Amino acid sequence: SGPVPSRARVYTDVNTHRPREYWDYESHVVEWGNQDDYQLVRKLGRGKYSEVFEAINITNNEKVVVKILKPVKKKKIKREIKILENLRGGPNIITLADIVKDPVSRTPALVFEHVNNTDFKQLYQTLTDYDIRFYMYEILKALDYCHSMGIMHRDVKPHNVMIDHEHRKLRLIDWGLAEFYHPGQEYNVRVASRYFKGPELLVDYQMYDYSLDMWSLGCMLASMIFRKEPFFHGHDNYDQLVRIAKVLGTEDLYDYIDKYNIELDPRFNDILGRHSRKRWERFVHSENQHLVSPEALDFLDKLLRYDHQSRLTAREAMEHPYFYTVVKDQARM
Numbered sequence: 323s324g325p326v327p328s329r330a331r332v333y334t335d336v337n338t339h340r341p342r343e344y345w346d347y348e349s350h351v352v353e354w355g356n357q358d359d360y361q362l363v364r365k366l367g368r369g370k371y372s373e374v375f376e377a378i379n380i381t382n383n384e385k386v387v388v389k390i391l392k393p394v395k396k397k398k399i400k401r402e403i404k405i406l407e408n409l410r411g412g413p414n415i416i417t418l419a420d421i422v423k424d425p426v427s428r429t430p431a432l433v434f435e436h437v438n439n440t441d442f443k444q445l446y447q448t449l450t451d452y453d454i455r456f457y458m459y460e461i462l463k464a465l466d467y468c469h470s471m472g473i474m475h476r477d478v479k480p481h482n483v484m485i486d487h488e489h490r491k492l493r494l495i496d497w498g499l500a501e502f503y504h505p506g507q508e509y510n511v512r513v514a515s516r517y518f519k520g521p522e523l524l525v526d527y528q529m530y531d532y533s534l535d536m537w538s539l540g541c542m543l544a545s546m547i548f549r550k551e552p553f554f555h556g557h558d559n560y561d562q563l564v565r566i567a568k569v570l571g572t573e574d575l576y577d578y579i580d581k582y583n584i585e586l587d588p589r590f591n592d593i594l595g596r597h598s599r600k601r602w603e604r605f606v607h608s609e610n611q612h613l614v615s616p617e618a619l620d621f622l623d624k625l626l627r628y629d630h631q632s633r634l635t636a637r638e639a640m641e642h643p644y645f646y647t648v649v650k651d652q653a654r655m
């Protein structure tokens with residue numbers, strides 16, 4: 323018959339217990355400011371949906387980041403604004419400062435409190451063992467917070483982690499793909515970048531939850547501790563699942579498919595083959611051995627599961643022995 327339904331293990335009903343206006347972003351009324359309170363200084367980045375600029379707030383000479391949105395459904399814009407407003411002031415969440423339109427072009431833009439244009443991808447292949455643990459813990463604070471607030475990011479990847487390494491500060495950015503979790507809701511599987519897509523996305527299981535972000539986090543961790551970018555290097559979305567199957571093995575994949583009664587795209591029938599679950603020791607070599615420990619491998623193993631329900635939650639991840647020295651030093655400071 324149909325796919326077997328699924329529910330988030332944690333924060334299942336948090337949006338239900340909120341007022342409608344918290345999560346009903348389509349009904350959100352945006353007060354659009356004037357982009358001429360800002361002067362653009364320089365281009366920081368370009369994305370599928372926006373051009374990103376360093377800018378100055380003329381009124382207080384404060385540095386900001388302006389994300390000038392390429393044309394898009396009003397619905398998607400309200401969703402991102404409402405999520406950013408809901409998460410504002412949260413640990414390691416980018417701060418939305420203002421919402422503006424160019425008076426002439428009427429192009430909408432989001433104004434964020436300034437952070438360094440240095441994305442995590444620029445230096446996550448050069449970190450010490452301790453700093454990987456430190457920054458991973460900081461990302462988990464942001465995920466446990468947004469999950470606790472009924473929101474899944476759905477685009478967790480190095481490019482969406484802005485780090486000020488000098489001040490050991492981290493922000494999770496680009497909430498453009500983020501959604502509210504509602505129990506029983508079926509979501510678009512066309513989210514996240516190929517290398518970070520969870521198996522639920524790749525086999526077209528739509529009733530997914532916060533646990534999607536914990537797969538993406540596992541992909542990031544594996545890439546850092548093994549110095550292998552990306553860890554799962556698919557040619558396309560079909561081959562992406564093959565790359566996962568060659569590590570996690572096909573037995574747990576077919577058990578997962580069976581458990582949720584997933585109808586596997588016929589394209590998979592010839593390409594998945596039959597693979598053992600590989601021991602992580604397989605990826606350890608002289609140039610990454612200093613970043614790999616039993617703690618790191620035990621932690622990674624508990625993120626990278628086919629079955630979304632079997633993955634650590636953000637808070638369970640934060641309690642893993644891998645972070646004991648980070649937790650201790652945090653209390654010390």
Ligand SMILES: Brc1c(Br)c(Br)c2[nH]nnc2c1Br
Nearest residue numbers: 357360362423424429430431
């Ligand atoms: Br805000 C904003 C927007 Br929206 C646009 Br479009 C701009 N073009 N030049 N300067 C601009 C600023 Br500031």
Ligand SMILES: Brc1c(Br)c(Br)c2[nH]nnc2c1Br
Nearest residue numbers: 366367374387434439495496
């Ligand atoms: Br660079 C950069 C910065 Br800085 C921020 Br803040 C962004 N928010 N969405 N996309 C962003 C990009 Br690209």
Ligand SMILES: [Cl-]
Nearest residue numbers: 443479480481
């Ligand atoms: Cl990335």
Ligand SMILES: [Cl-]
Nearest residue numbers: 598599600601
């Ligand atoms: Cl093995």
Ligand code: NA
Nearest residue numbers: 611612614615
């Ligand atoms: Na080691």
